[PDB]
Amino acid sequence: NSTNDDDSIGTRWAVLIAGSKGYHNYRHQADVCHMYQILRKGGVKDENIIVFMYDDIAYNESNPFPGIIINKPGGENVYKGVPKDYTGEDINNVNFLAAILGNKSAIIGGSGKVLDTSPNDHIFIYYAXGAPGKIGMPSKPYLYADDLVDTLKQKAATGTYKSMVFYVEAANAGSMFEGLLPEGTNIYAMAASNSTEGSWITYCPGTPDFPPEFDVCLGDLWSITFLEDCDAHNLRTETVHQQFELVKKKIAYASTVSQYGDIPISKDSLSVYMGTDPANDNRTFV
Numbered sequence: 001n002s003t004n005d006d007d008s009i010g011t012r013w014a015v016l017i018a019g020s021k022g023y024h025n026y027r028h029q030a031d032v033c034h035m036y037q038i039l040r041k042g043g044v045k046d047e048n049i050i051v052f053m054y055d056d057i058a059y060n061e062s063n064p065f066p067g068i069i070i071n072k073p074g075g076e077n078v079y080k081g082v083p084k085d086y087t088g089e090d091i092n093n094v095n096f097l098a099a100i101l102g103n104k105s106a107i108i109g110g111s112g113k114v115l116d117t118s119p120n121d122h123i124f125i126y127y128a129x130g131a132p133g134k135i136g137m138p139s140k141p142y143l144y145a146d147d148l149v150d151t152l153k154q155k156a157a158t159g160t161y162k163s164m165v166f167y168v169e170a171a172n173a174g175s176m177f178e179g180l181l182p183e184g185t186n187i188y189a190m191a192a193s194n195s196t197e198g199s200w201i202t203y204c205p206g207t208p209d210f211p212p213e214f215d216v217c218l219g220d221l222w223s224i225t226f227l228e229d230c231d232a233h234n235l236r237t238e239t240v241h242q243q244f245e246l247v248k249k250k251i252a253y254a255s256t257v258s259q260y261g262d263i264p265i266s267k268d269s270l271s272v273y274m275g276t277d278p279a280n281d282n283r284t285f286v
């Protein structure tokens, strides 16, 4: 009965979630904070960015730089300005699925910020921290693939978006979408690993160039590969497909970057979802 038209050009929205907790899982919250920095430098408003992060890293007693979170040795503080929509045990299936669906009544804790999107809007979902057919939540119950796909199908039915890009960093990340995500939903998915592979961590203690102050890994290989790609050039000149082929080639030695769902959605430039940093205009992707 509802209308599929609106007088809006289209707003960029994002959901960023680190599914883990504990100081040793520093990498997942750093990844999600680095993605937030990419979005706000691209003009995505805080009001449209839903952040799920346990928030036990920046001021952890073990953190050598309190108030700071970095996602690469010698990198910049990515914790600065990150909204705190769902922190602690408010990062769960109930709140995560209600946020994607956009049901404020289903939210049991947290900010209550959900994807109250409209037909011309674009959604970018990024999850960091997996097993065959499931991805973690800081505490049990975990997020099972069938539940995530039921929510994405309910969201597709509403027609409250033009297109959605879902990036998953986890082991067996592909298993969340393989043979489940129907085409026609306008949802493109990119995963660090296929349904049967584990995913690599990077920026870990061990190499002689690692900072002595840190005892934890700063990032996840696929995440830092695509995040460092987004910071380097004008995202209006690089498509999601061009990023997929770049990261897939760049980390082929570790895992197989896989794509699922509505593949033609990947024809859009990354700026459709992330905007672009006005300081990177004179740097085109070649």
Ligand SMILES: *[C@@H]1O[C@H](CO)[C@@H](O[C@@H]2O[C@H](CO)[C@@H](O[C@H]3O[C@H](CO[C@H]4O[C@H](CO)[C@@H](O)[C@H](O)[C@@H]4O)[C@@H](O)[C@H](O[C@H]4O[C@H](CO)[C@@H](O)[C@H](O)[C@@H]4O)[C@@H]3O)[C@H](O)[C@H]2NC(C)=O)[C@H](O)[C@H]1NC(C)=O
Binding pocket: 001
């Ligand atoms: C998609 O959704 C639309 C919105 O919900 C649907 O519109 C609705 O259509 C139905 C008929 O299919 C209308 O039903 C009743 O309409 C009047 C009431 O109108 C007034 O009150 C409404 C609130 O109750 C307001 O919303 C209206 O603006 C208006 O002020 C009743 O008098 C009717 O009663 C008659 O019919 C019944 C049997 O059906 C008899 O038993 C009664 O005795 C009487 O003869 C209807 O019950 C409804 O008003 C309408 N809503 C609007 C706002 O337009 C639309 O139908 C739907 N499309 C499809 C395909 O399902």
Ligand SMILES: *[C@@H]1O[C@H](CO)[C@@H](O[C@@H]2O[C@H](CO)[C@@H](O[C@H]3O[C@H](CO)[C@@H](O)[C@H](O)[C@@H]3O)[C@H](O)[C@H]2NC(C)=O)[C@H](O)[C@H]1NC(C)=O
Binding pocket: 021, 022, 023, 024, 055, 056, 057, 059, 060, 061, 062
């Ligand atoms: C800094 O990181 C620490 C390590 O990840 C983290 O320690 C963890 O703290 C939680 C909360 O106290 C402990 O979990 C406990 O949760 C409830 C608390 O009442 C208990 O019922 C449980 O039995 C459980 O023990 C973890 O055990 C603890 N982990 C470790 C390794 O010590 C700190 O909390 C983090 N600090 C900040 C500022 O967030």
Ligand SMILES: *[C@@H]1O[C@H](CO)[C@@H](O[C@@H]2O[C@H](CO)[C@@H](O[C@H]3O[C@H](CO)[C@@H](O)[C@H](O)[C@@H]3O)[C@H](O)[C@H]2NC(C)=O)[C@H](O)[C@H]1NC(C)=O
Binding pocket: 103, 105, 106
């Ligand atoms: C948004 O989240 C809402 C809360 O989780 C949810 O509302 C709940 O909807 C169910 C039905 O789907 C209702 O459950 C039962 O309620 C009636 C009355 O008691 C019973 O007769 C039925 O058996 C029914 O199953 C809940 O009562 C209802 N809760 C509230 C507070 O309204 C919405 O459905 C969710 N919306 C969407 C679009 O997903």
Ligand SMILES: *[C@@H]1O[C@H](CO)[C@@H](O[C@@H]2O[C@H](CO)[C@@H](O[C@H]3O[C@H](CO)[C@@H](O)[C@H](O)[C@@H]3O)[C@H](O)[C@H]2NC(C)=O)[C@H](O)[C@H]1NC(C)=O
Binding pocket: 194, 195, 196, 197, 256
């Ligand atoms: C996920 O990526 C895996 C690569 O990391 C991939 O594994 C590879 O799968 C092929 C089969 O498709 C294996 O080859 C098989 O067949 C040859 C003969 O043609 C035999 O000699 C082999 O022993 C084997 O049975 C590759 O060996 C295998 N490589 C590894 C390292 O596992 C998975 O198939 C991918 N999974 C999904 C769900 O796509």
Ligand SMILES: *[C@@H]1O[C@H](CO)[C@@H](O[C@@H]2O[C@H](CO)[C@@H](O)[C@H](O)[C@H]2NC(C)=O)[C@H](O)[C@H]1NC(C)=O
Binding pocket: 282
């Ligand atoms: C792309 O790079 C810079 C980006 O600024 C541009 O070059 C100079 O930019 C400063 C201001 O930032 C101006 O003062 C200069 O006059 C700019 N030069 C020119 C020729 O525009 C420029 O837009 C691009 N550079 C090149 C070499 O094309």
